[PDB]
Amino acid sequence: YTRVVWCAVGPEEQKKCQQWSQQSGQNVTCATASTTDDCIVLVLKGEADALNLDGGYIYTAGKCGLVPVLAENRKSSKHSSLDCVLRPTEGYLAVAVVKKANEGLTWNSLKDKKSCHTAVDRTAGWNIPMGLIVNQTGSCAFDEFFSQSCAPGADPKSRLCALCAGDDQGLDKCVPNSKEKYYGYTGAFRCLAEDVGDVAFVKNDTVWENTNGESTADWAKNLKREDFRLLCLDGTRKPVTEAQSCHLAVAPNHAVVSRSDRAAHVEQVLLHQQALFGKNGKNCPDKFCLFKSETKNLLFNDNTECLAKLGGRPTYEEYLGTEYVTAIANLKKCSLEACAF
């Protein structure tokens, strides 16, 4: 009923979910899975109700009948008067980041280099860059393009996982959850920051949130914006201040999905949960903040201002957009009446 079971990916998200559960009086409860895909499955079975997903998984989930309910909304500049929950979503910029000291490394010389991806199947870390690379190469062997990488979710024995490090014990190497050191936006960027990889496929925001004192995490403490460069599709290199003219694409924001028969109810519970634990929430920062977790982006991205209502009750195809939807279809022809489970 007004009770919602959230699906947590990995033990760290489980921990944050439990706090949220404790503070919600149990209006929100938790289920945990090792992978986002397993979480998709728990929702289909009806053992969990919702979770926040990157666009790539929204695509997987959509083919299986799950729908967009509310989307992450971060601070903008245009469309000022509108409240956050009513304001349109902008989408983030997918970028390719390199070290400035690594001269002569451009989009046109990425072959045989070392890469850092958020996870297999994600928008900025995989779908966009690999779709572009397959497109340009005219060959479905994206697994041979880079010499070594860390792409959580690929075969641990393959070169796509050679750069991944697992947890502090060396266990769970390449798993697509935060236990993997170089998982997600922050992980992929850390992979580049520590010179494990030559390039990182992350979003524009990740660079800003983890440099010039914004992080304080020990690996990011001393990172400086000028030491990084974005790779543009025209073979050029630009400062990270130029993301508007040097991105690989703009991605649809992450969004909360659920089985359609449960959407209306998940929507009403969440809107109330954010009134309590959101940005200007009754109990944040006092008791619990839904959008905080110190640069780890647990359950939701840390830069989320609020969860917004979607305009025009969009299907997953409309929400992702035709442009992005055909990009994925074309890449998956390498790896359509579907649903993977």
Ligand X SMILES: OC[C@H]1O[C@@H](OC[C@H]2O[C@H](OC[C@@]3(O)O[C@H](CO)[C@@H](O)[C@@H]3O)[C@H](O)[C@@H](O)[C@@H]2O)[C@H](O)[C@@H](O)[C@H]1O
Ligand Y SMILES: *[C@@H]1O[C@H](CO)[C@@H](O[C@@H]2O[C@H](CO)[C@@H](O[C@@H]3O[C@H](CO)[C@@H](O)[C@H](O)[C@@H]3O)[C@H](O)[C@H]2NC(C)=O)[C@H](O)[C@H]1NC(C)=O
Ligand Z SMILES: *[C@@H]1O[C@H](CO)[C@@H](O[C@@H]2O[C@H](CO)[C@@H](O[C@H]3O[C@H](CO)[C@@H](O[C@@H]4O[C@H](CO)[C@@H](O)[C@H](O)[C@@H]4O)[C@H](O)[C@@H]3O)[C@H](O)[C@H]2NC(C)=O)[C@H](O)[C@H]1NC(C)=O
Ligand U SMILES: *[C@@H]1O[C@H](CO)[C@@H](O)[C@H](O)[C@H]1NC(C)=O
CA gap 243, 58 in Å, rounded: 25
CA gap 76, 90 in Å, rounded: 8
Read off the tokens for 113.
């280099």
Binding mask 88-107 for ligand X (x = CB under 6 A): xxxx----------------
Q: String of b and e for 113-148 (b: at least 16 CB within 10 Å)?
A: bbbbbbbbbbbbbbbbbbbbbbeeeeeeebbebbeb
Q: Are 124 and 156 in contact (CB under 8 A)?
A: no
Binding mask 27-66 for ligand U (x = CB under 6 A): x---------------------------------------
Q: Does 253 bind Fe ion (CB under 5 A)?
A: no
Residue from 99, 208, 225, 321 that binds ligand Z (CB under 6 A)?
208
Please compute, for residue 84, the number of CA atoms within 13 A of its CA located in the half-sphere on the CB side: 17
Dihedral sign for Cα atoms in the order 55, 57, 59, 62: negative
CA gap 151, 116 in Å, rounded: 6
Q: Does 2 bind ligand U (CB under 6 A)?
A: yes
Binding mask 264-293 for ligand U (x = CB under 6 A): ------------x-----------------
Least distance (Å) from ligand X to the CB of residue 9? Answer: 20
Residue among 182, 178, 183, 203 nearest 194 (CA):
182
Residue from 14, 24, 32, 123 that binds ligand U (CB under 6 A)?
24
**C-beta closer to ligand U: residue 41 or 271:** 271
Q: Select the span of 172-180, 201-209, 280-288, 304-312 touching ligand X (CB under 6 A).
A: 304-312
Residue from 9, 31, 43, 132 that binds ligand Y (CB under 6 A)?
132
Least distance (Å) from ligand Z to the CB of residue 306? Answer: 14
| Residues facing residue 94 across a β-bridge | 203, 249
Q: Which residues bind ligand Y (CB under 6 A)?
A: 131-132, 135, 323, 326-327, 330
Q: Which residues bind Zn ion (CB under 5 A)?
A: 318
Which residues line the annotated binding site for Fe(3+)? Answer: 54, 92, 185, 254
